[PDB]
Amino acid sequence: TEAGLLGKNIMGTGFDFELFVHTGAGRYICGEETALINSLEGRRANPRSKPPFPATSGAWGKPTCVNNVETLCNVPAILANGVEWYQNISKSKDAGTKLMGFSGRVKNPGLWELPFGTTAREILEDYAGGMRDGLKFKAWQPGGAG
Amino acid sequence: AFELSAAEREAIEHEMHHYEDPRAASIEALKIVQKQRGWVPDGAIHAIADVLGIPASDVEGVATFYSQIFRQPVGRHVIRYCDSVVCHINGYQGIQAALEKKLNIKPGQTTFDGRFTLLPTCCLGNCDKGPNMMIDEDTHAHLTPEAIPELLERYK
Amino acid sequence: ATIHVDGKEYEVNGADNLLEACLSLGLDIPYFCWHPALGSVGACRQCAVKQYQNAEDTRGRLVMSCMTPASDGTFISIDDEEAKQFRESVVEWLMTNHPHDCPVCEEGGNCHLQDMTVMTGHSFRRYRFTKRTHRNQDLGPFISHEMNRCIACYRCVRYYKDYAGGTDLGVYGAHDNVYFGRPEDGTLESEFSGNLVEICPTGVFTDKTHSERYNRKWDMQFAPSICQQCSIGCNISPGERYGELRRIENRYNGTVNHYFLCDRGRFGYGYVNLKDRPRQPVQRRGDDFITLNAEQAMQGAADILRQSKKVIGIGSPRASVESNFALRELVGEENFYTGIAHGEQERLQLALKVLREGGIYTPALREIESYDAVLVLGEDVTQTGARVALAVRQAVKGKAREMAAAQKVADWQIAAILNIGQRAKHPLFVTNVDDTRLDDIAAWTYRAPVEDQARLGFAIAHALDNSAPAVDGIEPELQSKIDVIVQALAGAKKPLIISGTNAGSLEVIQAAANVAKALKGRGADVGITMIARSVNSMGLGIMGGGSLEEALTELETGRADAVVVLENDLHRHASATRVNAALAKAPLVMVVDHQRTAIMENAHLVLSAASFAESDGTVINNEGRAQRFFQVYDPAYYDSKTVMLESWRWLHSLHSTLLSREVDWTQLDHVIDAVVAKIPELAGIKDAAPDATFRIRGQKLAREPHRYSGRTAMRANISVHEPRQPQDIDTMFTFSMEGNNQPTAHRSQVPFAWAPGWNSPQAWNKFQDEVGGKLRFGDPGVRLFETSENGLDYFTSVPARFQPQDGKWRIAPYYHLFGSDELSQRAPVFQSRMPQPYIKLNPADAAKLGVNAGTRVSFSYDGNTVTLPVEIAEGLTAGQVGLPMGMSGIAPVLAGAHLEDLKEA
Numbered sequence A: 001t002e003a004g005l006l007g008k009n010i011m012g013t014g015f016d017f018e019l020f021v022h023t024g025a026g027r028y029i030c031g032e033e034t035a036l037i038n039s040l041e042g043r044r045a046n047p048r049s050k051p052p053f054p055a056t057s058g059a060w061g062k063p064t065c066v067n068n069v070e071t072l073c074n075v076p077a078i079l080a081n082g083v084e085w086y087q088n089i090s091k092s093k094d095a096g097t098k099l100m101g102f103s104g105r106v107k108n109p110g111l112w113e114l115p116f117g118t119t120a121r122e123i124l125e126d127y128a129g130g131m132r133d134g135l136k137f138k139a140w141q142p143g144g145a146g
Numbered sequence B: 001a002f003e004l005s006a007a008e009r010e011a012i013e014h015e016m017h018h019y020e021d022p023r024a025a026s027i028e029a030l031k032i033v034q035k036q037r038g039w040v041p042d043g044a045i046h047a048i049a050d051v052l053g054i055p056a057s058d059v060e061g062v063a064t065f066y067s068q069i070f071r072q073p074v075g076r077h078v079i080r081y082c083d084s085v086v087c088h089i090n091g092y093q094g095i096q097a098a099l100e101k102k103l104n105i106k107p108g109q110t111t112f113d114g115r116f117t118l119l120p121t122c123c124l125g126n127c128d129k130g131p132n133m134m135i136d137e138d139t140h141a142h143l144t145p146e147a148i149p150e151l152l153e154r155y156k
Numbered sequence C: 001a002t003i004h005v006d007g008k009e010y011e012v013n014g015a016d017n018l019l020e021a022c023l024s025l026g027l028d029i030p031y032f033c034w035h036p037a038l039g040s041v042g043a044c045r046q047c048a049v050k051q052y053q054n055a056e057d058t059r060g061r062l063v064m065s066c067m068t069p070a071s072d073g074t075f076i077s078i079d080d081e082e083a084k085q086f087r088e089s090v091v092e093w094l095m096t097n098h099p100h101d102c103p104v105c106e107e108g109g110n111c112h113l114q115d116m117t118v119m120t121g122h123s124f125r126r127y128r129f130t131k132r133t134h135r136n137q138d139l140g141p142f143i144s145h146e147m148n149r150c151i152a153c154y155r156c157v158r159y160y161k162d163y164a165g166g167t168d169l170g171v172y173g174a175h176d177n178v179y180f181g182r183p184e185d186g187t188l189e190s191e192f193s194g195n196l197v198e199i200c201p202t203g204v205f206t207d208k209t210h211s212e213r214y215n216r217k218w219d220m221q222f223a224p225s226i227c228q229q230c231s232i233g234c235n236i237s238p239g240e241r242y243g244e245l246r247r248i249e250n251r252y253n254g255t256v257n258h259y260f261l262c263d264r265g266r267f268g269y270g271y272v273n274l275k276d277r278p279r280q281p282v283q284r285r286g287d288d289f290i291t292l293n294a295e296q297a298m299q300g301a302a303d304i305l306r307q308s309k310k311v312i313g314i315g316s317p318r319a320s321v322e323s324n325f326a327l328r329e330l331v332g333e334e335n336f337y338t339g340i341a342h343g344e345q346e347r348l349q350l351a352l353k354v355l356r357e358g359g360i361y362t363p364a365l366r367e368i369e370s371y372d373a374v375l376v377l378g379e380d381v382t383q384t385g386a387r388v389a390l391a392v393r394q395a396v397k398g399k400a401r402e403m404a405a406a407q408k409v410a411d412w413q414i415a416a417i418l419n420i421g422q423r424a425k426h427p428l429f430v431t432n433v434d435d436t437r438l439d440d441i442a443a444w445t446y447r448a449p450v451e452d453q454a455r456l457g458f459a460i461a462h463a464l465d466n467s468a469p470a471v472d473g474i475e476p477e478l479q480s481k482i483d484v485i486v487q488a489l490a491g492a493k494k495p496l497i498i499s500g501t502n503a504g505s506l507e508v509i510q511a512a513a514n515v516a517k518a519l520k521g522r523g524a525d526v527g528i529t530m531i532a533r534s535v536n537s538m539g540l541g542i543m544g545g546g547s548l549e550e551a552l553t554e555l556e557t558g559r560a561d562a563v564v565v566l567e568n569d570l571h572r573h574a575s576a577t578r579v580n581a582a583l584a585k586a587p588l589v590m591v592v593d594h595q596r597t598a599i600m601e602n603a604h605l606v607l608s609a610a611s612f613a614e615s616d617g618t619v620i621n622n623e624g625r626a627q628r629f630f631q632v633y634d635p636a637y638y639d640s641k642t643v644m645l646e647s648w649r650w651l652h653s654l655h656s657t658l659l660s661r662e663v664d665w666t667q668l669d670h671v672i673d674a675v676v677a678k679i680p681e682l683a684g685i686k687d688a689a690p691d692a693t694f695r696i697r698g699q700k701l702a703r704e705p706h707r708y709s710g711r712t713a714m715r716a717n718i719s720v721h722e723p724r725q726p727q728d729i730d731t732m733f734t735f736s737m738e739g740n741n742q743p744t745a746h747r748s749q750v751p752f753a754w755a756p757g758w759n760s761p762q763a764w765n766k767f768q769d770e771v772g773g774k775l776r777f778g779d780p781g782v783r784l785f786e787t788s789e790n791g792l793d794y795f796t797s798v799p800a801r802f803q804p805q806d807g808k809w810r811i812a813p814y815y816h817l818f819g820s821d822e823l824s825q826r827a828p829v830f831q832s833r834m835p836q837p838y839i840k841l842n843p844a845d846a847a848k849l850g851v852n853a854g855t856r857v858s859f860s861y862d863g864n865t866v867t868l869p870v871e872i873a874e875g876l877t878a879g880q881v882g883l884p885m886g887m888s889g890i891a892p893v894l895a896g897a898h899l900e901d902l903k904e905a
């Protein structure tokens, strides 16, 4: 806002945009996008039936699009380096990179940015470093608790 | 009786400036009252309802819906240990047993002197550094059951 | 549209969801969270059917029929095995935490959850763990709370908050510890909170008044009746047991009061069960009170009335059309007086002239919900005509409905409708002497005296059409708000003007008629609604007669030496001292009434009339719809000494004994024919219900369910021999289960809803042509008058601005839902609910008097100094004093009257 990148007349275009940070009150169901809309309006975070989608009538009945942090962080690279660059990151049907990583009883639990199509054994045996000493690998969840 | 202070009312009104509906500041108003008083008492529901212009049933439903809005009195420090799946694999049971042995209370209860209140919480988003535990403002990771008394002593 | 259910083809409305479409066809789908009036939210997940993509589809997909539109060419299956297994699973999941309470639960035999547990065929419990419990709240005198029985279906909060507009009932908690109720112990503040006992499909919210004297639904003797508590005319099902009125259930009428009553009508029936009611004719002899039977009373009254030189009759707006007509026939047309004051009668006659001669269509109560703008002039509707306030709330939500309909959102998808229509609403402009209960949704509220409200109405009428008389002396900010109201009413497609006789001002009614005429002249589809006071105010106004003051002058001058008072306590319409003097002067007072009134001490003869539960008759509601109410039980069946006849039967037999010295207990249809012959304006009461010869394939209509029990032991303490079944010759109903109550029976008068498998109030779905619509084979009741071809003229009598003069306090009427209706006040459950009588004062007037909030002040009216504690009313204007109309000592005739000598006590 101090640099003129937010607020009124952003970079002389005339586009007015204001950005707020809404800190939640600790409930998992608020991550659901329609329930996120309900909790943003100060209601009990009950999700909403679709149709209608949030794109037609979302926050306070207005058109509203909900996106993840990582998607909105992927956007500026696309707008700065082009479209064919983003399509030519990986030779897969899922374009672009992704924040992946293994956690739980591994040598190096963490987060790394990898292209799509990277196998999970590659992540486990190269970035995570495999299981720790005296531990036999039994199962794995690819994408969290759900 | 209950009465909102000037600072609480000013903060609630400034939060009401950020939304096109005053109802949308209910969560933040409850959090403001909770920051100033430790928890949300019974008259605070009607006070926040009067400030925002929404029914007290709506404010009470929001207050009892969300886990981190306390409608019962707590201690001076809220111990919140993660009991989710990655911290289960990393062994939060030792942490919970150490906290129960040190504080001599069950989860959800408060000590006799009102120093700590023990609560399990959801995943703290620090699964690669588990087991984690969030005391009032600070998240502590890579926890061991022998480091619990040295960590609780700094919270007087 | 066209849907294919289980291989069979049906034609349904495409705007409907699949659940209501299939329920209209007669297909049984279990459901909990859906209600016809509340829309669809998809919570309980009970209505699951299997939808196929096309005709040659085998896999399908489980959908919720309440959330799925009934589009053209829609293939579904209800009785598929996967859908049945899922519905049984949902019932089982609801049963895991449900308490073992059915024997000790007031909803047993009336429970939608019981019916849907049986209907899904779930009867084997394989859950073995602990059941969650809950602590109950105290919700007041009317609604009992038992949160253990909750299935978390959100019907209560959706009704009470989204529909009823209440604010003190929500859902609190989380994952499966969801709790429904108030944030704290206290009385539910809604005037329509009593509909929760039928909205809730379990025993969480129960009728506490019914619970104190409880019996099951199969033991009830029901009848179709009309609520007697105000002028709206909501259809009710009173059910009795052991000779006392046990419960008032809602009776569905798709034209009037579809699923909902108000709390006055539902909980103010307890006056019928009072132990001081007259049960035999009583004739005084010196200081003694000799009890007579029917024939001795008729012969003695006929002899004394024959000796008297002139007998006058005083009717009442509580009595039915037949009883007032029978009194008019007994005393003569010229000697019949409507037992209401002259100003009250003038306002009632003006309201009648506006309704049936103003050329503007007066809507039914359900039709109110389809109007695009509402202007309420002078009428505190929530305390006098409460169902109209509920309908007005629906008409206000119509804007959100219209906005969602613009975005191709279905009308039953209520959550999306409320999301699109955040706080946008149709215009509502209410005017009153103080704050109304409609102020939370009103676009503007005008707190002003009745002169100023009438002036605002005339100013609106002049600004809409310049041919209307203008108002001089309008402040610029008030003129700007006038312009706001005019811009809202002129842009509306269907404006509605609601006034009534409760404001106590003729000019308020005139201003409302002027606004409606100005909107009619612009081409708008305007409607007008007058709110009367009592159950048969409109019928007594149509029949007509002199005022109560004229009858009092006749008694006081000595021209009348006999008076017959019909169902009139006479203190609510005239001063008690004058009434007592006139009645003590008259050498013969005969009181035909069903409640112990104060004038019975001066009565030479008291005839024990029947109340609505023990009598048949017709009443005319505020819109001019004739409605027949039927007798619920015979009072003489349990107590053989009780001589409690209909008022028209008493008066007709008295007329017969007066003329021919023989007693004639007539029939109801004979009196109906006499009314439609003598009074052509009331000719529509013939078609209100069919006569006593009406049969459904030869058999009568049953008053009680087929499983009615105790038939050989309910009177066994009196005598082991069973008595005769009471013969009903007045009507088409029978006093037994030997009758017809099929949902597919060609009739409009339904005593109660019951179908096999559907024991709850959801059994009304089988009795309608489509669910949530009209009753099958039409709703009961007929409009007496049609809309006139040409309207009235503009009322040019514009009142002046209200001016406060010293030593004269204008009485501003404050009505209360619990306490302004006389028979409701008599009900013992309203004593704990009605407020203490507070006299309302402006802060400036109380400061001038030196009076603070709570100090008791005394005022003299009609030479009677009475003291009341003071409540400070900010919205009241200076020079006015607020009084609770109808309560103890304060008659409704005092509305608009002046007050003298208001000092601190």
Ligand SMILES: Cc1cc2nc3c(=O)[nH]c(=O)nc-3n(C[C@H](O)[C@H](O)[C@H](O)COP(=O)(O)O)c2cc1C
Pocket (backbone or CB within 6 Å): A028, A029, A030, A031, A032, A033, A034, A066, A067, A068, A069, A071
């Ligand atoms: C139970 C549940 C929890 C969810 N929690 C989150 C969450 O915490 N963060 C998130 O970004 N999406 C979450 N989602 C996914 C959202 O519904 C939505 O897909 C996402 O927030 C935005 O979509 P996007 O991936 O295109 O950006 C959750 C979904 C469900 C059903």
Ligand code: SF4
Pocket (backbone or CB within 6 Å): C098, C099, C100, C101, C102, C105, C106, C107, C108, C109, C111, C112, C113, C114, C149, C201, C202, C203, C204
């Ligand atoms: S609510 Fe219904 S199922 Fe539950 S205890 Fe009562 S009658 Fe039985």
Ligand code: SF4
Pocket (backbone or CB within 6 Å): C149, C150, C151, C152, C153, C154, C155, C156, C157, C180, C199, C200, C201, C202, C204, C205
């Ligand atoms: S209290 Fe009754 S209406 Fe409300 S959610 Fe529970 S079962 Fe449904």
Ligand code: SF4
Pocket (backbone or CB within 6 Å): C227, C228, C229, C230, C231, C232, C233, C234, C257, C261, C262, C263, C264, C265, C266, C385, C386, C387, C388
């Ligand atoms: S609105 Fe009037 S007629 Fe209807 S239930 Fe209430 S008191 Fe009875």
Ligand code: FES
Pocket (backbone or CB within 6 Å): B082, B083, B084, B085, B086, B087, B088, B122, B123, B124, B125, B126, B127, B130, B131, B132
């Ligand atoms: S599982 Fe404990 S921090 Fe995520």
Ligand code: FES
Pocket (backbone or CB within 6 Å): C019, C030, C031, C032, C033, C034, C041, C042, C043, C044, C045, C046, C047, C064, C065, C066, C067
């Ligand atoms: S009736 Fe359809 S989900 Fe409840």
Ligand SMILES: [Ca+2]
Pocket (backbone or CB within 6 Å): C614, C615, C616, C631, C728, C730, C731
């Ligand atoms: Ca009868």
